[PDB]
Amino acid sequence: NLPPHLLFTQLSSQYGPLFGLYAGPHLTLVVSEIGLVREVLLQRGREFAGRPKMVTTDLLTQGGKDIAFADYSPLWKNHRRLVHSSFTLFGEGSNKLQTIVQEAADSLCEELQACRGQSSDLSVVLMRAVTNVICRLVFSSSYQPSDPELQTVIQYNDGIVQTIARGGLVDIKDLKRLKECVSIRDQLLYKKLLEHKKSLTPGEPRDLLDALLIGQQRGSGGADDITEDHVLMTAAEAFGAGVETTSTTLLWTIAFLLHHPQLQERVQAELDECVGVDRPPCLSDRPHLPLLDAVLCEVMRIRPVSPILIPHVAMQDTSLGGHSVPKGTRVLVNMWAIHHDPKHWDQPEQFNPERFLESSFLPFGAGPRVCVGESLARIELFLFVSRPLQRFSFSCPSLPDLQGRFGVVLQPERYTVTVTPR
Numbered sequence: 001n002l003p004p005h006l007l008f009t010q011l012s013s014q015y016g017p018l019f020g021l022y023a024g025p026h027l028t029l030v031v032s033e034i035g036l037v038r039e040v041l042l043q044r045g046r047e048f049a050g051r052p053k054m055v056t057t058d059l060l061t062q063g064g065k066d067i068a069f070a071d072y073s074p075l076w077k078n079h080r081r082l083v084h085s086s087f088t089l090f091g092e093g094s095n096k097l098q099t100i101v102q103e104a105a106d107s108l109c110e111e112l113q114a115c116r117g118q119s120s121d122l123s124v125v126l127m128r129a130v131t132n133v134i135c136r137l138v139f140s141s142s143y144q145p146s147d148p149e150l151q152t153v154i155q156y157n158d159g160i161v162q163t164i165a166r167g168g169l170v171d172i173k174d175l176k177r178l179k180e181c182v183s184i185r186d187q188l189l190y191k192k193l194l195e196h197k198k199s200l201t202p203g204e205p206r207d208l209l210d211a212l213l214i215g216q217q218r219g220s221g222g223a224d225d226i227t228e229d230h231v232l233m234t235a236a237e238a239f240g241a242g243v244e245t246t247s248t249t250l251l252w253t254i255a256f257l258l259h260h261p262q263l264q265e266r267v268q269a270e271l272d273e274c275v276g277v278d279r280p281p282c283l284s285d286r287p288h289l290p291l292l293d294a295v296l297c298e299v300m301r302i303r304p305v306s307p308i309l310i311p312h313v314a315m316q317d318t319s320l321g322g323h324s325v326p327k328g329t330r331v332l333v334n335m336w337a338i339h340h341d342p343k344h345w346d347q348p349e350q351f352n353p354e355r356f357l358e359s360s361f362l363p364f365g366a367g368p369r370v371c372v373g374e375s376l377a378r379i380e381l382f383l384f385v386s387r388p389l390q391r392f393s394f395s396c397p398s399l400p401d402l403q404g405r406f407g408v409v410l411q412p413e414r415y416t417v418t419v420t421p422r
């Protein structure tokens with residue numbers, strides 16, 4: 001009838017913004033209002049920082065050794081501290097990410113030239129580009145578009161997406177097809193991991209994978225220290241969490257610029273004044289591109305990639321609203337609600353980047369469980385989007401459907417778009 005994110009958004013008007021669903025022994029709360037969600041993420045962030053141990057996830061994360069589906073704990077804090085710093089170093093700390101992402105936007109731009117004068121479907125092409133970026137950032141891969149090993153990775157990532165899309169988080173088989181995908185994935189990375197452990201300079205540099213292995217190098221004894229399996233799982237997750245979210249956010253951006261050609265022209269003016277028409281845009285231009293940033297913020301608001309977050313589990317007996325919340329309780333954060341709440345947003349259903357130009361905006365979550373790839377994401381999307389807008393104009397050749405479909409993320413239905421440069 002109606003997807004859960006809209007259903008509970010819709011019920012929040014008449015009945016409350018906190019809803020309790022029952023199934024089996026576990027209570028499941030759904031939270032559709034900013035104060036409540038802030039209570040879960042920030043205010044009692046630590047209490048609700050647990051994750052649920054499903055069987056798909058176990059396969060995925062070799063038993064909860066990743067970041068996303070592991071419980072808050074001494075081991076998980078060191079692990080994430082290790083991760084967070086790794087990313088910071090590659091993005092803010094220097095220009096390895098900038099370079100990776102610029103040089104990839106080249107390839108992407110080049111691929112698009114050749115697609116003129118078609119009414120191409122991009123999505124594959126972008127998928128490729130963001131996947132390549134993450135291959136680069138994690139292994140120092142040097143694949144070009146045609147490369148078969150890159151093609152392997154997209155194919156096992158793709159299989160995992162397809163598999164999960166049909167089936168379970170079981171919030172609210174064929175589980176063998178995942179194991180298969182997972183195995184080829186686990187092996188290929190491990191190989192890369194072996195290749196990396198052999199050539200390893202701690203001072204620096206040269207890779208997210210290096211950076212974890214160093215961190216794991218410094219690994220006194222069991223209790224709260226990361227094994228090597230977490231390194232591998234964290235590398236796998238950089239794709240798992242990073243590709244489909246980033247590619248989709250790009251797919252929406254473009255989808256919306258088709259509906260708003262004027263706005264696409266306005267951002268293109270911004271780029272022309274501020275950046276050359278030759279120079280590639282780089283991170284230092286960010287402050288000087290206020291509209292673009294607005295556009296990006298708006299896309300992330302209006303079509304949240306995960307309109308319901310992965311559950312937050314109640315680590316101890318706690319409370320929410322003024323209501324007690326037993327240990328083990330699952331809490332679904334309704335990202336669509338808080339991003340479409342008319343109490344907090346004027347014309348929340350209209351695409352208006354100007355609303356970010358002049359509070360309950362949490363595109364990356366927040367609190368202990370906040371996105372660990374936020375800095376990387378933001379840089380990815382800035383760099384990617386400035387370049388194609390600088391080099392290309394995207395028009396309709398009937399306009400794409402902006403409702404959205406739920407794969408493993410919320411995403412627009414496949415569309416054709418005319419791609420035209422200068």
Ligand SMILES: CC(=O)[C@H]1CC[C@H]2[C@@H]3CCC4=CC(=O)CC[C@]4(C)[C@H]3CC[C@]12C
Pocket residue numbers: 068157160161164239240241244245305306309310408409
């Ligand atoms: C909540 C969020 O936006 C991110 C954080 C972790 C991410 C998940 C991590 C596991 C995963 C692996 C994949 O290969 C596909 C997408 C999924 C299913 C990811 C969907 C987006 C998630 C759920």
